[PDB]
Enzyme design. Structure first.
Site, PDB file in Angstrom:
ATOM      1  N   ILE A   1       0.818  -1.204   0.000  1.00 32.26           N
ATOM      2  CA  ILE A   1       0.000   0.000   0.000  1.00 32.26           C
ATOM      3  C   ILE A   1       0.857   1.261   0.000  1.00 32.26           C
ATOM      4  O   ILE A   1       0.422   2.299  -0.503  1.00 32.26           O
ATOM      5  CB  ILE A   1      -1.114  -0.021   1.076  1.00 32.26           C
ATOM      6  CG1 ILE A   1      -0.567  -0.408   2.448  1.00 32.26           C
ATOM      7  CG2 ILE A   1      -2.255  -0.945   0.654  1.00 32.26           C
ATOM      8  CD1 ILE A   1      -0.730   0.634   3.426  1.00 32.26           C
TER       9      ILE A   1
ATOM     10  N   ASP B   1       8.161  14.140  15.539  1.00 32.64           N
ATOM     11  CA  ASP B   1       7.782  14.190  14.126  1.00 32.64           C
ATOM     12  C   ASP B   1       6.269  14.219  13.963  1.00 32.64           C
ATOM     13  O   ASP B   1       5.706  13.508  13.122  1.00 32.64           O
ATOM     14  CB  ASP B   1       8.441  13.036  13.335  1.00 32.64           C
ATOM     15  CG  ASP B   1       8.506  13.271  11.824  1.00 32.64           C
ATOM     16  OD1 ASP B   1       8.327  14.433  11.390  1.00 32.64           O
ATOM     17  OD2 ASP B   1       8.680  12.292  11.086  1.00 32.64           O
TER      18      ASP B   1
ATOM     19  N   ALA C   1      10.696   2.756   4.282  1.00 32.95           N
ATOM     20  CA  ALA C   1       9.927   1.568   4.645  1.00 32.95           C
ATOM     21  C   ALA C   1       8.772   1.291   3.689  1.00 32.95           C
ATOM     22  O   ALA C   1       8.040   2.208   3.299  1.00 32.95           O
ATOM     23  CB  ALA C   1       9.395   1.709   6.064  1.00 32.95           C
TER      24      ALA C   1
END
Ligand SMILES: O=C(NCc1ccccn1)c1ccc(-n2cc(-c3ccncc3)cn2)cc1
Length: 306
Positions: free
Chosen positions: A16, A125, A19
């Site tokens: 999908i 983040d 990484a």
């Protein structure tokens, strides 16, 4: 070689994201999972940082780690299935969120981040691409790779290379998130990285006419260039804007335990093992993030659906 072990426990579905993220089905329970695939010889400290944090954090608004598998070339992280997509994609789809819908979402972000800080971590983040919706349209915080124990969302001190407190940097990032939820665009934005850097340092942003006075004040309280002038997380929990239409502070404490085990799930799990109930409970309580951990937590997710 790399997928051999994983295929003993999971039936792979489609990629999908690249990484690399693959969707998969846990064979034993039939539950859907997402699998993050990271190459060791293509940052290894970023993988180990995320794994260490996720083994220690467990919360209703944090995307759950179920299983960690490793080969000479890959590290696989089996994670909680979030089919509602990114918050980033959701805001774009809607153009912008009303103040009322922003509050629904923002109270969940506050819940996750306050818990992360309570555990001695700072995310570092925070951005809408790192928040996903599960099947119940509840938010789940992801990517703990930069956590401590994206330039448009970074606090001025963090860009400058100065020492900072992670909790203060997270509060600034949450202020940028708050603005994006209600406006549908960034408060500091530019095609040139140096002009963006200048805009963040100055801390001046446009205030659209659709923002209420209370929204404007909360933004001002979070978006302070001086980190000592930013609102504390404690004061965010019961802020007047946060309490509007709710009348209760944000519930940040985890509802997802390490100590308490669910009797029904222990029983469902034990039928698959050649061991007694007490031995299985003691093994579950070790939280090794092996196939046993995945089986127990996925049975808890299956129970939650019913
Ligand atoms: O669209 C999705 N499913 C429906 C679908 C898609 C294609 C065909 C048929 N049906 C889907 C499901 C899960 C996810 N998740 C990503 C992470 C994730 C967690 C941590 N770091 C990075 C990503 C966790 N869940 C995304 C997307």
């Amino acid at each position: 070689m790399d997928y051999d072990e994983l295929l003993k426990y999971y039936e792979l579905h489609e990629t999908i994201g690249t990484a690399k993220v693959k969707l998969a089905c846990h064979i034993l329970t039939g539950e859907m999972v997402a699998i993050k695939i990271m190459d060791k010889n293509t940052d290894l400290p970023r993988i180990k940082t995320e794994i260490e944090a996720l083994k220690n954090l467990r919360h209703q608004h944090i995307c759950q780690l179920y299983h960690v598998l490793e080969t000479a070339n890959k590290i696989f992280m089996v994670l909680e299935y979030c089919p509602g997509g990114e918050l980033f994609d959701y805001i774009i789809s809607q153009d912008r969120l009303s103040e009322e819908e922003t509050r629904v979402v923002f109270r969940q972000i506050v819940s996750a981040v306050a818990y992360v800080h309570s555990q001695g971590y700072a995310h570092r983040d925070l951005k809408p691409e790192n928040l996903l919706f599960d099947e119940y349209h509840k938010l789940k915080l992801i990517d703990f790779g930069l956590c401590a124990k994206s330039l448009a969302y970074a606090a001025p001190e963090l860009i400058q290379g100065k020492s900072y407190l992670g909790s203060e940097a997270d509060v600034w990032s949450m202020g940028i998130l708050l603005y994006v939820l209600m406006c549908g665009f960034l408060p500091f934005d530019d095609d040139n990285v140096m002009a963006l850097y200048k805009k963040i340092m100055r801390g001046k942003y446009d205030v659209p006419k659709w923002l209420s006075p209370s929204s404007i004040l909360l933004l001002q309280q979070m978006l302070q260039v001086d980190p000592k002038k930013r609102i504390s997380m404690k004061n965010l929990l019961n802020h007047p804007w946060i309490m509007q239409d709710y009348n209760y502070p944000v519930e940040w404490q985890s509802k997802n335990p390490f100590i308490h085990l669910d009797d029904d799930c222990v029983t469902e799990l034990s039928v698959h093992h050649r061991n007694n109930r007490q031995t299985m409970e003691d093994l579950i309580s070790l939280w090794q993030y092996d196939h046993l951990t995945a089986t127990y937590l996925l049975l808890l997710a299956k129970k939650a659906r019913g």
